[PDB]
Enzyme design. Structure first.
Site, PDB file in Angstrom:
ATOM      1  N   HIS A  31      -8.909 -11.500  18.605  1.00 60.01           N
ATOM      2  CA  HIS A  31      -8.157 -11.602  20.083  1.00 60.01           C
ATOM      3  C   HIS A  31      -8.785 -11.732  21.764  1.00 60.01           C
ATOM      4  O   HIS A  31      -9.703 -10.772  21.381  1.00 60.01           O
ATOM      5  CB  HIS A  31      -7.030 -10.310  20.066  1.00 60.01           C
ATOM      6  CG  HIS A  31      -6.114 -10.142  21.258  1.00 60.01           C
ATOM      7  ND1 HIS A  31      -5.089  -9.502  22.175  1.00 60.01           N
ATOM      8  CD2 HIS A  31      -5.195 -12.020  21.545  1.00 60.01           C
ATOM      9  CE1 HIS A  31      -4.286  -9.854  23.275  1.00 60.01           C
ATOM     10  NE2 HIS A  31      -4.205 -11.537  22.750  1.00 60.01           N
ATOM     11  N   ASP A  35      -2.730  -8.186  25.639  1.00 63.30           N
ATOM     12  CA  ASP A  35      -1.301  -9.031  25.936  1.00 63.30           C
ATOM     13  C   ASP A  35      -0.266  -7.868  26.209  1.00 63.30           C
ATOM     14  O   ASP A  35      -1.237  -6.613  26.554  1.00 63.30           O
ATOM     15  CB  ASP A  35      -0.885  -8.935  24.693  1.00 63.30           C
ATOM     16  CG  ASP A  35      -1.650 -10.771  23.674  1.00 63.30           C
ATOM     17  OD1 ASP A  35      -1.718 -11.407  24.759  1.00 63.30           O
ATOM     18  OD2 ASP A  35      -1.408  -9.928  22.556  1.00 63.30           O
ATOM     19  N   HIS A 110       5.857 -11.839  26.319  1.00 62.21           N
ATOM     20  CA  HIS A 110       4.443 -11.372  26.625  1.00 62.21           C
ATOM     21  C   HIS A 110       3.922 -12.240  26.691  1.00 62.21           C
ATOM     22  O   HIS A 110       3.574 -13.370  27.204  1.00 62.21           O
ATOM     23  CB  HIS A 110       3.363 -10.388  25.754  1.00 62.21           C
ATOM     24  CG  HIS A 110       3.028 -11.958  24.977  1.00 62.21           C
ATOM     25  ND1 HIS A 110       3.664 -12.036  23.729  1.00 62.21           N
ATOM     26  CD2 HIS A 110       1.618 -11.836  25.235  1.00 62.21           C
ATOM     27  CE1 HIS A 110       2.785 -12.714  22.875  1.00 62.21           C
ATOM     28  NE2 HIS A 110       1.889 -11.925  23.501  1.00 62.21           N
ATOM     29  N   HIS A 112      -0.578 -13.619  27.363  1.00 59.90           N
ATOM     30  CA  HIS A 112      -1.930 -13.569  27.304  1.00 59.90           C
ATOM     31  C   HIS A 112      -2.243 -13.452  28.666  1.00 59.90           C
ATOM     32  O   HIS A 112      -1.973 -14.942  28.801  1.00 59.90           O
ATOM     33  CB  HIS A 112      -1.515 -14.439  26.321  1.00 59.90           C
ATOM     34  CG  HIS A 112      -3.449 -14.947  25.594  1.00 59.90           C
ATOM     35  ND1 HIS A 112      -3.803 -13.944  24.900  1.00 59.90           N
ATOM     36  CD2 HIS A 112      -4.088 -15.783  25.779  1.00 59.90           C
ATOM     37  CE1 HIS A 112      -4.975 -14.790  24.128  1.00 59.90           C
ATOM     38  NE2 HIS A 112      -5.362 -15.566  25.402  1.00 59.90           N
TER      39      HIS A 112
END
Ligand code: ZN
Length: 133
Positions: A31, A35, A110, A112
């Site tokens: 990732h 988030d 959310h 990012h």
């Protein structure tokens, strides 16, 4: 052109909400940002003064905005529901540039958020936001 000794520039949060996913591996895959979870429509802010260089659809993000800051860092705002900026627009730290999205999926709504010094490779946003000055 400006003369300045210490290079510090004001930085604020890109969105408010629950920190649900950090920078690093998750479920077997990297990732490359963080988030921040909140309801659809939650305001998204430019973290620093800068110039918008992207605002539109993006595969995988749904929609996104990118802002280029004067030191060359690019910040990335993904999964937005909508955006209120245009490419080339100058924005102020904390000014609203978008609304939070990520609707209709098993992962809740959310933002990012990514940080890319020099416009290059992403870094962990948490120290970049919370460990300045
Ligand atoms: Zn993410």
């Amino acid at each position: 052109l400006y003369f300045q000794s210490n290079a510090g520039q004001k930085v604020v949060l890109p969105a408010e909400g629950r920190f649900t996913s950090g920078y690093g591996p998750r479920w077997g895959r990297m990732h490359n940002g963080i988030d921040i979870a909140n309801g659809i429509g939650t305001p998204i802010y430019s973290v620093m003064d800068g110039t918008v260089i992207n605002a539109g659809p993006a595969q995988g993000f749904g929609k996104w905005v990118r802002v280029r800051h004067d030191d060359g860092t690019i910040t990335v705002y993904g999964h937005v529901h909508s955006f209120n900026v245009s490419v080339g627009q100058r924005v102020t730290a904390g000014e609203q540039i978008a609304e939070m999205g990520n609707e209709g999926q098993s992962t809740g709504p959310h933002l990012h958020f990514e940080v890319r010094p020099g416009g290059g490779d992403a870094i962990d946003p948490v120290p970049w936001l919370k460990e300045r000055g």
